[PDB]
Write a protein that holds these residues in place. Structure first.
Motif, PDB file in Angstrom:
ATOM      1  N   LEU A 187       5.747  11.095  -1.430  1.00 14.18           N
ATOM      2  CA  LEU A 187       6.758  10.570  -0.512  1.00 14.18           C
ATOM      3  C   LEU A 187       8.077  11.291  -0.628  1.00 14.18           C
ATOM      4  CD1 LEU A 187       5.403   8.202   1.016  1.00 14.18           C
ATOM      5  CD2 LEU A 187       7.092   6.699  -0.064  1.00 14.18           C
ATOM      6  N   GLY A 188       8.325  11.890  -1.791  1.00 10.14           N
ATOM      7  CA  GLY A 188       9.554  12.635  -2.031  1.00 10.14           C
ATOM      8  C   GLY A 188      10.849  12.001  -1.540  1.00 10.14           C
ATOM      9  N   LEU A 189      11.051  10.732  -1.869  1.00 11.70           N
ATOM     10  CA  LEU A 189      12.251  10.018  -1.451  1.00 11.70           C
ATOM     11  C   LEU A 189      13.004   9.462  -2.635  1.00 11.70           C
ATOM     12  CD1 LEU A 189      11.099   7.792   1.602  1.00 11.70           C
ATOM     13  CD2 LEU A 189      12.607   9.775   1.651  1.00 11.70           C
ATOM     14  N   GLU A 190      14.134   8.843  -2.327  1.00 16.83           N
ATOM     15  CA  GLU A 190      14.976   8.211  -3.316  1.00 16.83           C
ATOM     16  C   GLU A 190      15.888   7.246  -2.592  1.00 16.83           C
ATOM     17  OE1 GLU A 190      16.938  11.218  -6.070  1.00 16.83           O
ATOM     18  OE2 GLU A 190      16.243   9.714  -7.519  1.00 16.83           O
ATOM     19  N   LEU A 191      15.610   5.964  -2.767  1.00 15.94           N
ATOM     20  CA  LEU A 191      16.410   4.927  -2.145  1.00 15.94           C
ATOM     21  C   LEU A 191      17.804   4.908  -2.763  1.00 15.94           C
ATOM     22  CD1 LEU A 191      17.237   2.278  -0.782  1.00 15.94           C
ATOM     23  CD2 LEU A 191      15.928   1.060  -2.523  1.00 15.94           C
ATOM     24  N   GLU A 237       0.826  -1.191   0.000  1.00 13.33           N
ATOM     25  CA  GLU A 237       0.000   0.000   0.000  1.00 13.33           C
ATOM     26  C   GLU A 237       0.872   1.257   0.000  1.00 13.33           C
ATOM     27  OE1 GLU A 237      -1.160   2.728   2.410  1.00 13.33           O
ATOM     28  OE2 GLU A 237      -3.149   1.974   2.989  1.00 13.33           O
ATOM     29  N   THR A 238       1.957   1.238   0.752  1.00 13.61           N
ATOM     30  CA  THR A 238       2.804   2.411   0.785  1.00 13.61           C
ATOM     31  C   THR A 238       3.359   2.672  -0.597  1.00 13.61           C
ATOM     32  OG1 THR A 238       3.416   1.834   3.018  1.00 13.61           O
ATOM     33  CG2 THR A 238       4.699   3.527   1.919  1.00 13.61           C
ATOM     34  N   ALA A 239       3.861   1.616  -1.234  1.00 18.88           N
ATOM     35  CA  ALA A 239       4.435   1.715  -2.578  1.00 18.88           C
ATOM     36  C   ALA A 239       3.433   2.357  -3.529  1.00 18.88           C
ATOM     37  CB  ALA A 239       4.833   0.325  -3.095  1.00 18.88           C
ATOM     38  N   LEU A 240       2.202   1.841  -3.494  1.00 17.25           N
ATOM     39  CA  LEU A 240       1.111   2.331  -4.329  1.00 17.25           C
ATOM     40  C   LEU A 240       0.875   3.806  -4.085  1.00 17.25           C
ATOM     41  CD1 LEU A 240      -1.595  -0.465  -4.007  1.00 17.25           C
ATOM     42  CD2 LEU A 240       0.144  -0.192  -5.794  1.00 17.25           C
ATOM     43  N   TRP A 241       0.943   4.196  -2.823  1.00 20.67           N
ATOM     44  CA  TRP A 241       0.755   5.583  -2.481  1.00 20.67           C
ATOM     45  C   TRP A 241       1.902   6.399  -3.079  1.00 20.67           C
ATOM     46  CZ3 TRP A 241      -3.387   7.847  -1.863  1.00 20.67           C
ATOM     47  CH2 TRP A 241      -4.433   7.365  -1.062  1.00 20.67           C
ATOM     48  N   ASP A 242       3.122   5.876  -2.947  1.00 20.16           N
ATOM     49  CA  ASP A 242       4.330   6.520  -3.472  1.00 20.16           C
ATOM     50  C   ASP A 242       4.189   6.684  -4.989  1.00 20.16           C
ATOM     51  OD1 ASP A 242       6.919   7.560  -3.729  1.00 20.16           O
ATOM     52  OD2 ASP A 242       7.922   5.602  -3.638  1.00 20.16           O
ATOM     53  N   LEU A 243       3.823   5.589  -5.651  1.00 16.61           N
ATOM     54  CA  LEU A 243       3.631   5.558  -7.099  1.00 16.61           C
ATOM     55  C   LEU A 243       2.526   6.513  -7.576  1.00 16.61           C
ATOM     56  CD1 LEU A 243       4.374   4.007  -9.806  1.00 16.61           C
ATOM     57  CD2 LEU A 243       2.653   2.310  -9.095  1.00 16.61           C
ATOM     58  N   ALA A 244       1.370   6.466  -6.921  1.00 15.71           N
ATOM     59  CA  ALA A 244       0.261   7.330  -7.307  1.00 15.71           C
ATOM     60  C   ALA A 244       0.636   8.808  -7.198  1.00 15.71           C
ATOM     61  CB  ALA A 244      -0.957   7.028  -6.445  1.00 15.71           C
ATOM     62  N   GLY A 245       1.371   9.151  -6.146  1.00 16.00           N
ATOM     63  CA  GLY A 245       1.769  10.530  -5.942  1.00 16.00           C
ATOM     64  C   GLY A 245       2.714  11.018  -7.019  1.00 16.00           C
ATOM     65  N   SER A 261      11.250   1.717  11.476  1.00 16.78           N
ATOM     66  CA  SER A 261      11.807   1.365  10.178  1.00 16.78           C
ATOM     67  C   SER A 261      12.817   2.378   9.628  1.00 16.78           C
ATOM     68  CB  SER A 261      10.666   1.131   9.174  1.00 16.78           C
ATOM     69  OG  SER A 261       9.659   2.122   9.263  1.00 16.78           O
ATOM     70  N   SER A 262      13.310   2.144   8.412  1.00 15.34           N
ATOM     71  CA  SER A 262      14.289   3.034   7.782  1.00 15.34           C
ATOM     72  C   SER A 262      13.696   4.416   7.498  1.00 15.34           C
ATOM     73  CB  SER A 262      14.765   2.442   6.460  1.00 15.34           C
ATOM     74  OG  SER A 262      13.990   2.959   5.392  1.00 15.34           O
ATOM     75  N   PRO A 263      14.458   5.281   6.805  1.00 12.94           N
ATOM     76  CA  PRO A 263      13.949   6.622   6.489  1.00 12.94           C
ATOM     77  C   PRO A 263      12.680   6.557   5.638  1.00 12.94           C
ATOM     78  CG  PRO A 263      16.314   6.629   6.384  1.00 12.94           C
ATOM     79  CD  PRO A 263      15.899   5.180   6.502  1.00 12.94           C
ATOM     80  N   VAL A 264      12.516   5.449   4.920  1.00  6.83           N
ATOM     81  CA  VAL A 264      11.360   5.223   4.054  1.00  6.83           C
ATOM     82  C   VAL A 264      10.083   5.118   4.887  1.00  6.83           C
ATOM     83  CG1 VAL A 264      10.419   3.739   2.243  1.00  6.83           C
ATOM     84  CG2 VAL A 264      12.870   3.923   2.558  1.00  6.83           C
ATOM     85  N   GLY A 265       9.919   3.979   5.544  1.00  4.90           N
ATOM     86  CA  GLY A 265       8.751   3.787   6.371  1.00  4.90           C
ATOM     87  C   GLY A 265       8.482   5.026   7.197  1.00  4.90           C
ATOM     88  N   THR A 266       9.538   5.602   7.765  1.00  2.21           N
ATOM     89  CA  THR A 266       9.412   6.793   8.599  1.00  2.21           C
ATOM     90  C   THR A 266       8.773   7.982   7.900  1.00  2.21           C
ATOM     91  OG1 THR A 266      11.335   6.220   9.935  1.00  2.21           O
ATOM     92  CG2 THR A 266      10.628   8.507   9.928  1.00  2.21           C
ATOM     93  N   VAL A 267       9.103   8.172   6.630  1.00  5.53           N
ATOM     94  CA  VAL A 267       8.558   9.292   5.888  1.00  5.53           C
ATOM     95  C   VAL A 267       7.124   8.976   5.475  1.00  5.53           C
ATOM     96  CG1 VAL A 267       8.888  10.848   3.953  1.00  5.53           C
ATOM     97  CG2 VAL A 267      10.848   9.869   5.083  1.00  5.53           C
TER      98      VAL A 267
END
Ligand SMILES: [Mg+2]
Ligand SMILES: [Mg+2]
Lengths: 394, 396
Positions: free
Chosen positions: A373-377, A91-99, A317-323
């Motif tokens: 999400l404005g991130l970059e792994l 779900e998070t990924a989907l949210w990231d992708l949709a945004g 979690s990492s900076p990801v989950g956290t954001v």
């Protein structure tokens, strides 16, 4: 452009060992993290097993996509935990992708932003605990165990924080008579209070300090220990009793002036619905990467809002989950503080590339205006810490 | 001699769904258990495996102490319910079996003893329609004349020696269901359902017992309107009219009709059945031993219901291994009613285990031996002939 779900791949990074989930809509993708639950291999196969339901779907309708995988697991543990934690990352990924696809920051897909800077609180650990959160190294009947704590706290205030959290449990300790019952001995009791008292004086007041019990004890002990906490004015006392009977928590909450907190181990929105009904807490702390994702989390916060109950999500979690959570905390009017368990993990920030520079700054997390999400792994970095079974994408 | 746990292995077979098999060794000896078909058998597999570092060396005789060891071991790792619980359920069975072989006493004699030696079953007459999510394949409810096909099976079961039948009546993916997200039942979709019911009742007669599953897919209104209609057919019970999350809802429905409400296959652990019985939401209870937590858990669950004079009828969807263990529990409790059999459609169901006399089931009943630990043996042969390609490695 009518995008569609193309591929779904995982990967296991070693943090606090979480599983990352990537969802591709052609050239595009979103990133998700899954609360470090049970075996990583497990979440993995649960997540991948969800690909069929995802393939060919449109990412922008995440809530519908959620109810889809969720209802598909009705007869295979969809009420459960693992199956849902696994769903949390997707779900998070989907949210990231949709945004990213619509070019808007996740929080604008959650109703906007009540705030743009989210405040945090840091955990303070003693020795070395195991999966069951038991101290393998350190404990109540120890030595410089308390000072060790006071130190971590000091550094926490030093690094810009004003809210700290520490546990007070030790069941595999010599101070504990029996492992199976939840009883606390006279001596074991006051040893805890002292651990608390110590840190309280070190940090002085005007510094929010929560205490965790990891739900190990029985009714009488919980009650006894809780009254003891009253003269300390704690932000809250976490899970005094075992997460399975909410009626007991309510009975405890109802027994003292010290505020009670829980949520870390309750999953769906339907469950918090019951938690709230029993007037079981003063603060609710669900884990976005574990309970069902941002969408699920917002609801839970919305439910609590109707009772003027504060929202302080659990996060490890990492900076990801956290954001991901930071986004949720920003679209919720009744947010209090977001958890940070990385004071002891120096490489934490190397897992991702965030706009300003570091994610955390001055004890807060400054969310940007970038798209979703404005991130970059950082893949080489993540690989450099990959857990070593769960394949690293390829 | 001091038997200590030495090895823990898994294996995924093809029952009604890919089911993880668990084998625990305490030296030359071992115990056998079967997990419920949950999510990808691979996950169940890993969970089970991740559990080995906690058993090695333990006296497999204090079984209950070991469940609590693992269950509590999983506090912050999804142990409250679902997958992790279904997994331990398998491991539990093994130990409960291993222990019986060691002490040399049938399992029910470890669960307090037996009230009855042979347990009655009920036949699910929708076994092959199976969708991973309980949806009905290639058509569903309405169609040319499905009613025919169902009456055929109904009778096939009675002939087979059964006097308890189970039937479905939900077709959310059918042409008569307006929307897949709400749980509303349309005027005509409603008649269609009652039709299925009527058709089967008139055929088999009033002495055969028939229960109906709704796979919990509907809203309050539909549930209530449909339940009020189930009143004239004297059903054995009506299974899950509403979604498994909110029990207050299930309870609200039960107060509505005179049709017996039964539920329990989607709730795990004693802690959750407590709340169930608390709300007074069921006429019958039906957890799944290989899904809920284990024989011990399942027994406690039955005991809670006993308190309220409520029948215990576990949900069963496993092979001879899981199934038989289920009967052991069915024997050790006074409020046992009927155990489920969901394999009327697969000829090789019995070819998985070598059972004492001839087959396991015999005329809608299962007779239990005094042979230590369950009283059955894995026909390693058949077992492997039906392994599952998808991926959990076999016992080696
Ligand atoms: Mg905690
Ligand atoms: Mg059913």
């Amino acid at each position: 452009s009518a995008p569609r779900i193309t591929r779904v791949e995982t990967a296991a990074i070693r943090a606090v060992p979480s599983v990352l989930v990537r969802v591709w809509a052609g050239d595009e993708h979103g990133l998700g993290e899954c609360y470090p639950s049970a075996p990583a291999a497990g979440i993995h196969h649960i997540v991948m097993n969800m690909e069929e339901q995802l393939l060919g779907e449109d990412p922008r309708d995440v809530e519908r996509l959620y109810e889809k995988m969720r209802r598909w697991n009705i007869f295979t543990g969809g009420q459960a935990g693992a199956v849902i934690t696994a769903l949390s990352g997707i779900e998070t990924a989907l949210w990231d992708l949709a945004g990213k696809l619509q070019g808007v920051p996740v929080y604008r897909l959650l109703g906007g932003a009540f705030r743009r800077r989210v405040r945090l609180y840091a955990d303070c650990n003693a020795g070395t605990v195991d999966a069951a959160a038991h101290h393998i190294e350190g404990g109540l009947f120890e030595e410089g165990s308390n000072e060790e704590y006071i130190a971590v706290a000091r550094e926490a205030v030093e690094r810009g924080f004003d809210a700290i959290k520490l546990d007070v449990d030790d069941i595999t300790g010599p101070l504990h008579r029996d492992f199976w019952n939840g009883a606390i001995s006279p001596r074991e009791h006051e040893a805890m209070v002292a651990r608390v008292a110590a840190v309280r004086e070190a940090v002085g007041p005007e510094v929010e300090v929560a205490i965790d019990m990891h739900g190990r004890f029985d009714i009488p002990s919980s009650i006894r220990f809780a009254r003891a906490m009253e003269p300390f004015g704690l932000l809250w006392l976490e899970e005094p009793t075992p997460p399975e009977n909410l009626d007991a928590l309510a009975e405890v909450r109802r027994s003292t002036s010290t505020p009670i907190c829980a949520g870390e181990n309750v999953y769906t929105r339907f469950d918090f619905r019951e938690l709230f009904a029993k007037r079981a807490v003063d603060y609710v702390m669900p884990d976005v990467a574990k309970c069902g994702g941002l969408a699920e989390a917002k609801r839970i916060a919305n439910l609590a809002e109707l009772d003027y109950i504060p929202f302080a999500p659990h996060n490890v979690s990492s900076p990801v989950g956290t954001v991901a959570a930071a986004h949720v905390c920003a679209a919720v009017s009744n947010f209090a503080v977001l958890e940070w368990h990385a004071i002891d993990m120096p490489h934490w920030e190397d897992f991702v590339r965030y706009p300003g520079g570091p994610v955390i700054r001055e004890g807060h997390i400054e969310l940007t205006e970038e798209p979703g999400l404005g991130l970059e792994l950082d893949e080489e970095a993540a690989f450099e810490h990959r857990h070593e079974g769960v394949p690293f994408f390829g």
